[PDB]
Amino acid sequence: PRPTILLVGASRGLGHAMAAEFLKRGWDVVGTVRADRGRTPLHALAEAYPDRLRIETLDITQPEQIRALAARLSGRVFDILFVNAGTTNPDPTQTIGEVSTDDFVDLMITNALSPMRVVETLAGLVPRDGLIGIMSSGQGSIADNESGQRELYRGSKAALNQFMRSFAARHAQTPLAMVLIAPGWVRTELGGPDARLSIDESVPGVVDVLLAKRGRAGLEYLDYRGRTVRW
Amino acid sequence: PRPTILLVGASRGLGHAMAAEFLKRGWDVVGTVRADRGRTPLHALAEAYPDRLRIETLDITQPEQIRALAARLSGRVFDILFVNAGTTNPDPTQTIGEVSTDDFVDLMITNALSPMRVVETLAGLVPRDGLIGIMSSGQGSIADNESGQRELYRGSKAALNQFMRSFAARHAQTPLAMVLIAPGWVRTELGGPDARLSIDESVPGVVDVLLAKRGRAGLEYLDYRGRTVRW
Numbered sequence: 001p002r003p004t005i006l007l008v009g010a011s012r013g014l015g016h017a018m019a020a021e022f023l024k025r026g027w028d029v030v031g032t033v034r035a036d037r038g039r040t041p042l043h044a045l046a047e048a049y050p051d052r053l054r055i056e057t058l059d060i061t062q063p064e065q066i067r068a069l070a071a072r073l074s075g076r077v078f079d080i081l082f083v084n085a086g087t088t089n090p091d092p093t094q095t096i097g098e099v100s101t102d103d104f105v106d107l108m109i110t111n112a113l114s115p116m117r118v119v120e121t122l123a124g125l126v127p128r129d130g131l132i133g134i135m136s137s138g139q140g141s142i143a144d145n146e147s148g149q150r151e152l153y154r155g156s157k158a159a160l161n162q163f164m165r166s167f168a169a170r171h172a173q174t175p176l177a178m179v180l181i182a183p184g185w186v187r188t189e190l191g192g193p194d195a196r197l198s199i200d201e202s203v204p205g206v207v208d209v210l211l212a213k214r215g216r217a218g219l220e221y222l223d224y225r226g227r228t229v230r231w
Numbered sequence: 232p233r234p235t236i237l238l239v240g241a242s243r244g245l246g247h248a249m250a251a252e253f254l255k256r257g258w259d260v261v262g263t264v265r266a267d268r269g270r271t272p273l274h275a276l277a278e279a280y281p282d283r284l285r286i287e288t289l290d291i292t293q294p295e296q297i298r299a300l301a302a303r304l305s306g307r308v309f310d311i312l313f314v315n316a317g318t319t320n321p322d323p324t325q326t327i328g329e330v331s332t333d334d335f336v337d338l339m340i341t342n343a344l345s346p347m348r349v350v351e352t353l354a355g356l357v358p359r360d361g362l363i364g365i366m367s368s369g370q371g372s373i374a375d376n377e378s379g380q381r382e383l384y385r386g387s388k389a390a391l392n393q394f395m396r397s398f399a400a401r402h403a404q405t406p407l408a409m410v411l412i413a414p415g416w417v418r419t420e421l422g423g424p425d426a427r428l429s430i431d432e433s434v435p436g437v438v439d440v441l442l443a444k445r446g447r448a449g450l451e452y453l454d455y456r457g458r459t460v461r462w
């Protein structure tokens with residue numbers, strides 16, 4: 001009967017840290033990994049929590065795998081669905097006018113289309129008063145984009161946020177809680193060596209925000225400190 | 232891709248209906264029939280789901296055929312292995328003191344030894360955190376046996392349940408989920424025309440139980456309503 005989070009993209013980085021943090025707060029976790037990555041930090045974590053962490057497989061860019069996960073989990077209910085999975089393009093220093101079509105397509109599919117297909121397909125596994133979240137980025141804020149850089153990633157997260165606003169409009173005036181999280185610039189393999197925050201300086205706050213967002217209907221764009229991020 | 236159940240004994244009755252019900256839930260099914268039985272209701276079901284239901288042959292009382300199936304399914308992974316196959320003796324009104332040695336041996340082999348041999352030999356086709364189930368019966372409960380009748384069948388299912396408890400003990404340090412199902416008294420060729428439940432009143436609940444047991448390690452004895460059955 002323990003509360004359970006379905007955490008999509010939990011193999012490493014922020015997603016793995018989120019799984020560890022929910023487990024420390026007494027929740028169960030179903031976390032997803034991609035089949036191709038071999039053994040991950042999440043596999044090591046599952047050995048420490050053998051009865052409380054379950055690992056499922058999902059590449060979010062494969063719609064058949066999203067449906068397969070939905071079928072596997074159809075006898076389960078999740079208090080929170082959180083889509084952490086995201087990446088960046090091979091060469092983030094390229095401007096939008098320099099990126100290859102393949103790189104543009106790949107990142108828009110991975111970061112914008114695919115998290116939305118996950119939430120649309122798996123929303124039924126969450127109660128109607130539950131919480132659906134996606135890991136966005138402060139870089140997806142258009143109002144805050146005064147400096148550019150990381151051009152393709154920025155557009156992918158801006159598109160994600162807009163898609164999520166339209167999803168939220170279809171749930172207007174219902175109890176569903178929704179959140180786009182900006183975790184801060186964190187020293188993971190994605191954030192890089194110059195990132196301002198350690199994992200432990202971001203993830204407890206993200207988890208605090210998610211727990212507090214439950215029961216507060218509607219979509220918000222919130223950072224790891226609970227501050228509203230401008231669209 | 233899609234989750235797959237290996238359903239042993241799916242030709243007729245409850246087993247055939249379970250195949251149909253899993254297909255309705257977005258699962259794929261590999262179902263077994265006895266080769267010498269010619270065409271079965273499962274073959275008709277395969278006409279309607281030719282890409283999602285595959286039929287293999289197996290007489291569970293023939294160890295060489297269990298080994299042959301294991302080789303045939305080499306490299307396949309099944310989220311659920313469920314052994315449905317079972318029968319009863321030619322004259323169920325006979326007391327234990329009346330049954331012939333042949334009838335005793337035949338039923339003990341078919342209902343108790345053989346499902347366990349299937350489970351032991353095919354367990355390697357299921358993940359360490361998968362689900363292995365066997366169709367038992369409420370008649371196999373020793374604590375619930377206040378009224379007798381069906382004497383030989385009752386003993387065969389009690390032995391099955393005990394054998395499965397020992398199998399479960401060997402898996403106590405693993406996340407393997409296991410279930411013995413009591414489906415209720417159902418109007419199949421085995422249950423007879425006087426049985427209380429239609430197939431459709433039992434099978435959706437059995438499948439509900441299986442999908443909800445996936446991910447909950449350890450062995451339980453559960454009926455089609457999810458109630459615990461006393462050993």
Ligand SMILES: NC(=O)c1ccc[n+]([C@@H]2O[C@H](COP(=O)([O-])OP(=O)(O)OC[C@H]3O[C@@H](n4cnc5c(N)ncnc54)[C@H](OP(=O)(O)O)[C@@H]3O)[C@@H](O)[C@H]2O)c1
Nearest residue numbers: 009011012013014034059060085086137185186188190191
């Ligand atoms: N770190 C930061 O500074 C920062 C800032 C703002 C937002 N974010 C966001 O935070 C999230 C996690 O990033 P991170 O810093 O933890 O990066 P990370 O360490 O590189 O982890 C990325 C995670 O996403 C998964 N993933 C990527 N593509 C996937 C796909 N197709 N299907 C399934 N899973 C996939 C990865 O799985 P594999 O192991 O299989 O690759 C991994 O679990 C991303 O959405 C990112 O945009 C991060």
Ligand SMILES: NC(=O)c1ccc[n+]([C@@H]2O[C@H](COP(=O)([O-])OP(=O)(O)OC[C@H]3O[C@@H](n4cnc5c(N)ncnc54)[C@H](OP(=O)(O)O)[C@@H]3O)[C@@H](O)[C@H]2O)c1
Nearest residue numbers: 240242243244245265290291316317368416417419421422
């Ligand atoms: N019906 C009830 O009221 C009831 C109640 C409690 C438990 N159960 C259990 O439910 C299961 C299914 O029974 P049912 O009512 O559906 O009976 P059924 O209609 O007579 O079907 C029995 C099934 O078992 C298969 N089977 C029997 N011996 C086999 C063997 N040696 N190798 C392979 N398959 C074999 C049959 O295949 P063939 O077509 O080749 O014969 C058929 O698919 C049994 O385990 C039974 O004990 C039934």
Ligand SMILES: [Cl-]
Nearest residue numbers: 009010033034
């Ligand atoms: Cl992942």
Ligand SMILES: [Cl-]
Nearest residue numbers: 138182183184
């Ligand atoms: Cl951020």
Ligand SMILES: [Cl-]
Nearest residue numbers: 240242264265
């Ligand atoms: Cl059969």
Ligand SMILES: [Cl-]
Nearest residue numbers: 369413414415
């Ligand atoms: Cl029963």
